């Protein structure tokens, strides 16, 4: 009831990539825990940013972002409605929808996005915040199953990453992971044809 000392919610903040633009993908930090913390608060972020997939933290969490379209995508469930830091100050989102687990923001400048897929292939890989890049066979609107199952600690923290077409093309965002007795047998995501819903 006080309201002068009520607080506010940090921005979500870009503290790395998964870096695909060679014949290796792996993961490369770009601002460590404590910088984080306070460009959370700030929203005020000045390191450049390059590439498709971000990784980013709250104060409380971390997960992943993907460029599709210009618009730099991640899950509700990571963001809540959270503003994400900037060169300029916070940027409020520009897409946010509960019901999908969906939030988005204005790519950042540096980045670049994935073309959505239009191959109709049900041939997916995953790109987890390890740089692993994990075969998995659509099995469903917004299903697909690994091929080989893993725990579900190998997929913690890669919500708001993307499930790639064999060109490269974005089929969509992981939100969930299907499991039993821990072990991760299938994944639950946001086809890119929602995200395309949402944008208008
Ligand atoms: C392991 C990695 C997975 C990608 C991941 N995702 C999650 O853990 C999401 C968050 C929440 O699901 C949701 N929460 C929602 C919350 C909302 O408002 C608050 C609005 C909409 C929401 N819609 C969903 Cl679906 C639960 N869950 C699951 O995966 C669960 N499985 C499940 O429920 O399966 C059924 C559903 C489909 C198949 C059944 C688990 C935990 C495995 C038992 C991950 O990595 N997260 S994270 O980065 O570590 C992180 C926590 C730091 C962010
Ligand atoms: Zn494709």
Redesign the pocket.
């Known amino acids: 009831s006080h309201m002068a000392s009520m607080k506010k919610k940090g921005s979500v903040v870009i503290v790395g990539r998964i870096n695909l633009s060679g014949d290796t993908a792996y993961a490369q930090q770009t601002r460590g825990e404590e910088g984080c913390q306070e460009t959370s608060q700030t929203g005020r972020d000045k390191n450049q940013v390059e590439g498709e997939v971000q990784i980013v933290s709250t104060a409380t ?4 972002a993907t460029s599709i379209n210009g618009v730099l995508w991640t ?4 963001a ?1 409605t959270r503003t994400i830091a900037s060169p300029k100050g916070p940027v409020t989102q520009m897409y946010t929808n ?4 969906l939030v988005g923001w204005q790519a950042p400048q540096g980045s670049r996005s994935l073309t959505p897929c239009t191959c109709g292939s049900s041939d997916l890989y995953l790109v987890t ?1 390890h740089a692993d890049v994990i075969p998995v066979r659509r099995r469903g609107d917004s ?1 697909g199953s690994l091929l080989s199952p893993r725990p ?9 990453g993307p499930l790639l077409c064999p060109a490269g093309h974005a089929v969509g965002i ?6 039993t007795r821990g072990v ?1 047998k ?3 995501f946001i086809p890119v044809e929602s995200l395309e819903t949402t944008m208008r």
């Open positions: 969490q971390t997960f992943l899950v509700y469930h990571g809540g509960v019901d999908k687990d915040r299903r579900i600690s190998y997929l913690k923290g890669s919500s708001g992981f939100r969930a992971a299907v499991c991760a299938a994944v639950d």
